[PDB]
Amino acid sequence: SMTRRNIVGCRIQHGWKEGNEPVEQWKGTVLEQVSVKPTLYIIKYDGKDSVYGLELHRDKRVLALEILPERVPTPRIDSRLADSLIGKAVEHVFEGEHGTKDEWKGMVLARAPVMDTWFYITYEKDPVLYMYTLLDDYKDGDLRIIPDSNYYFPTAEQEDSLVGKQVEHAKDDGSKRTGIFIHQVVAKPSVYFIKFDDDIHIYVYGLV
């Protein structure tokens, strides 16, 4: 009945009411509307490094959704350099308690949609999708790349393009949760993103 511009590329704000916690105010920018599940949006919220998947129009936790008129920037950066980081295993330095710089092994997956000066990155010990302006880490010397790496993703078993196909995650407690493959990483074709129904995060998996 209607064909319209979607909200990908727009700035948004909305309340977030969950459990018994008080209401917070979220602001972010919509990166993608998932083709295989168009109720699902991928959002980078401000002040949150982890990328969220939310059914913005259906999720009861999302209150008074509003599209902001604010425009998204296209910052000046070394493009070839940015491209050269894609697919690289890295050692990413973070600040640890109590005074200890920590090295997190990670894998740069892609330049993010919409905010293309930011990078999709996941970590071996924390295999969900994160987003940073990595060139500022690399310039500050907090990003060492590992040209010859042995990187481990969590494994997804099969049983033929997988995006759009459903999964179950069988937990150690014997319970299961449902999800679906929403993305195949262009630079790393055996690596996929999965969204579980019961969880906000975007999970990064590899195929055998």
Binding site: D49, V93, F94, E95, D102, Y132, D140, D142
Partner: peptide, 6 residues
Amino acid sequence: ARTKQT
């Protein structure tokens, strides 16, 4: 240098 959040 980045802070790691929960």
